[PDB]
Design a protein around this ligand. Structure first.
Ligand SMILES: OC[C@H]1O[C@@H](O[C@@H]2[C@@H](O)[C@@H](O)O[C@H](CO)[C@H]2O)[C@H](O)[C@@H](O)[C@@H]1O
Length: 230
């Protein structure tokens, strides 16, 4: 396909259900993959402070396994996720990510679609605090919301793109998006956003949220099939 579509997982076993779909990459919100999937680029994540301990070592294995890309903290703007002030993110980014700039493309901490001061407000606070010394190849962002709130999806992604470009970061990954509701409500959403994401040159890579919910009892759900074929 576009080569932008990702497999976001917890159970590495379930990526087989997506074999031969237009997938180039995977991540699991962890620094280590828990296994191997052939022909797809695993992307390590520095989730938050709990990972600082191993991050050196973890970035080493992954670059050593040919990983082109590294991701930073998960939802520092949400208290039960990374839960990090923009200032502490800037510090820990510069410290723990910037060092791999020569060997890998670095993805920003991934914000929620929460309104300022969460979301892209936190990104701007982080981008301000970074003070042009954070080495960032791409912004990571997330959007969760009802299936019929599709417009808001696209505005958010554009606003993330606009925000990144103002700070000289030329692309975003949408590392999580989820159009909520019953199976049909979820399909139709993917029919609208997947083509839009695939041609929107502001979006380098994306992942619907997520593999483990798109498979059930070892079988693709109907949402699974749509994500695989559209
Ligand atoms: O279970 C998938 C993955 O979820 C992460 O947290 C998510 C958050 O990233 C966002 O989507 O909000 C939802 C709703 O609460 C959270 O579940 C976890 O950080 C990660 O460790 C987990 O593997």
């Amino acid at each position: 396909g576009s080569g932008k579509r990702g497999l976001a997982y917890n159970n590495i076993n379930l990526l087989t259900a997506f074999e031969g779909g237009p997938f180039s990459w995977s991540y699991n919100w962890e620094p280590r993959p828990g296994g191997y999937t052939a022909g797809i680029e695993y992307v390590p994540m520095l989730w938050g402070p709990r990972g600082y301990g191993s991050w050196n070592a973890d970035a080493e294995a992954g670059i050593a396994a040919g990983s082109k890309n590294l991701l930073a903290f998960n939802e520092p703007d949400i208290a039960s996720q990374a839960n990090m002030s923009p200032e502490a993110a800037a510090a820990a980014y510069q410290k723990y990510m910037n060092p791999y700039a020569a060997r890998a493309r670095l993805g920003s901490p991934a914000v929620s679609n929460g309104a300022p001061p969460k979301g892209l407000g936190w990104m701007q606070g982080f981008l301000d605090v970074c003070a042009g010394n954070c080495k960032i190849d791409f912004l990571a962002v997330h959007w969760h919301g009802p299936s019929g709130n599709v417009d808001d999806f696209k505005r958010y992604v554009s606003e993330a793109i606009a925000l990144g470009q103002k700070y000289g970061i030329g692309t975003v990954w949408v590392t999580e998006f989820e159009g909520q509701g019953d199976e049909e409500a979820q399909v139709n959403f993917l029919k609208e956003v997947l083509p839009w994401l695939d041609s929107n040159a502001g979006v380098e890579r994306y992942a619907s949220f997520f593999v483990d919910n798109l498979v059930k009892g070892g079988a693709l759900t109907s949402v699974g099939k749509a994500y695989k074929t559209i």
